Curated annotation (Swiss-Prot), chain A:
This is Hemagglutinin HA2 chain.
Swiss-Prot record, chain C:
This is Hemagglutinin HA1 chain. It comes from the Viruses.
Amino acid sequence: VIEKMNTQFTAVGKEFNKLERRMENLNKKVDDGFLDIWTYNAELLVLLENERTLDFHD
Amino acid sequence: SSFERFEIFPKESSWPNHTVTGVSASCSHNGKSSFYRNLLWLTGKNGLYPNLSKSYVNNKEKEVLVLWGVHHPPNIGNQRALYHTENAYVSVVSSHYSRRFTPEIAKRPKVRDQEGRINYYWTLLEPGDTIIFEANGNLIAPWYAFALSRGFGSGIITSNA
Amino acid sequence: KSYVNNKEKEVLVLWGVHHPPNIGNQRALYHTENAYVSVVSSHYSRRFTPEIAKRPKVRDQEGRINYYWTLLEPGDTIIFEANGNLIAPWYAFALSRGFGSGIITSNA
Ligand SMILES: *[C@@H]1O[C@H](CO)[C@@H](O[C@@H]2O[C@H](CO)[C@@H](O)[C@H](O)[C@H]2NC(C)=O)[C@H](O)[C@H]1NC(C)=O
Ligand SMILES: *[C@@H]1O[C@H](CO)[C@@H](O)[C@H](O)[C@H]1NC(C)=O
């Protein structure tokens, strides 16, 4: 679970101007999209692994 | 990875035919009117503001970040006091860059204690290329420039830690 | 003209610039050919000039009006200047923005 995560050096934040609001909102859309995907998958993955782990031990 | 701040256009030898002095109260330092260290405000000398022409060759194996600005007086009297032509422009070109700028003189709401404005512009000069600067007024000249060697992108973080 | 934003709201200010199809039209409405308008605020600056040209007709017009706008923050000021071709702001909107939502197209 840990090793398959691809960790790369990154630069997450981006700056936008007053008239670049659509770009800012797309940048936000991208962050929220990725965040909801990773959050949903991380929560769900852990719950599924926990059910299997407890069943594994039983 | 490397940020060399070098003097691109040495003050004393680069501009002997005009004024390389002049400060603003708005940039005051320790009570004295002042200005930026990497930029030089150019004004006329003894009534003259000659056409300027400068050329920098990038002889380093680095990109060079060149900064400059354009003065935008609040009025005509200010432009005439500093520059002696109303139809002022500056021009900056390189093998793959070209911009022409003119002042926009207007009354503006004050910011700090100023009515006029200075716009800031920049370009990255690739190794082996050249930047040619021209002006007949309103030039804030590059004085220092940075020879850059860029690393893997990282970021600007805001924190008081 | 100078408008001071004395409301605790952003003010949306609209204006436009007239772009005559020809010289006779510009002279008929404005009495200078070297017309410009200028709009500034503490953090805004634009200068505009007319572009006079014959254009294909749209509706029944040969000329055009461009529309421009800015959001004025509380406490700031917009200074407008012109010597011709100004479509002046008359009304403006004092805004208080909510969480972003959207423009939806539907005949429902
Ligand atoms: C550097 O930052 C300081 C802090 O904001 C500036 O000091 C303020 O200057 C304004 C006038 O422009 C005064 O009304 C404030 O009272 C000052 N603040 C303090 C805490 O003394 C300073 O002017 C800035 N200097 C430069 C060169 O940008
Ligand atoms: C300064 O002006 C003189 C003419 O008075 C000219 O010969 C000289 O080349 C100029 N120097 C520079 C750096 O422009």
